[PDB]
Each structure stands twice: as C-alpha cells, then as structure tokens.
Amino acid sequence: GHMSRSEVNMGLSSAGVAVQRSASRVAYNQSAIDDSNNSAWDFADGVLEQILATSRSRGYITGDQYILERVNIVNGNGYYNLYKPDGTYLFTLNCKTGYFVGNGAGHADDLDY
C-alpha cells in the first residue's frame, strides 16, 4: 500500500527484529532462499498484497507494518512467512498461489511436504 496497486514486498525491515523463525510451517531452506533467483519467489501480481490485505483483515497485521521473509521453495511454490513488526510469526504463504498456512501444536495445517 505505497506505490498504487500490486507491490509485493517485506513491508518492514526484519533487521534487528525478534522474528519467530522456529515458528515457521515451512523449512527456512537457506539454499532455496539463496536460490532467490528462482521464480519460485515471484508470487505473481498483488498476490502478496492480497494475503497481506487479508492478514490485516484477519488481525495479523496492519497496513504494510508486516514482516515477510523468504523461507522455502516447494515445487517452485516459494513459501514466505508473514511476521509482525515485532517479528511474530503469523503464517507461511505460497507466493505462487497466494495461499497461506497456519500453525498449531506441531501439525501440518495446510502443509503436505
């Protein structure tokens, strides 16, 4: 919610933030993460802004006060975690589908991998 429509970004800086990474539903695979050149990391168009628009609606975040992070590549469905400005894990989303998965008592909510 800065440019106009369809942006896709991390919205806040996860630098110094106390972000919950161990709370992630998908593996933080730094090899796929560093493989960032993948289109597995290209969500689509305002797809993130969707999930984010949703996140705020859900009560996960506000505006672009979110902290998104690259996590994993499954099938090329590059998964991104959404965090609070405090780094609090909200969910793991699929960039390629704009789907998003929640977390619980150590179970696959939407997961399969």
In DSSP notation, 58-96 reads: HTS--TT--EEEEEE-STT--EEEEE-TT--EEEEEETT
Closest CA to 31 of 88, 81, 73: 73
Q: Which helix (H) or strand (E) holds 56?
A: helix 47-58
Do 25 and 109 meet the contact criterion of CB atoms below 8 Å apart? Answer: yes
DSSP 11: B
From which experimental method does this structure derive? NMR
CA dihedral for 75, 79, 48, 3, sign (positive or negative)? negative
101 touches 25 (CB < 8 A): yes
Q: Amino acid letter at 12?
A: L
Take residue 31 and report the two structure tokens written for it: 């090899």
Range of the domain at 95: 1-113
In the chain, the number of structural domains is 1
Residue pointed to by tokens 């969707």: 50
- Is residue 60 within 8 A of residue 20, CB to CB? The reply is no
Contacts of 50 (CB under 8 A, 6+ apart): 98
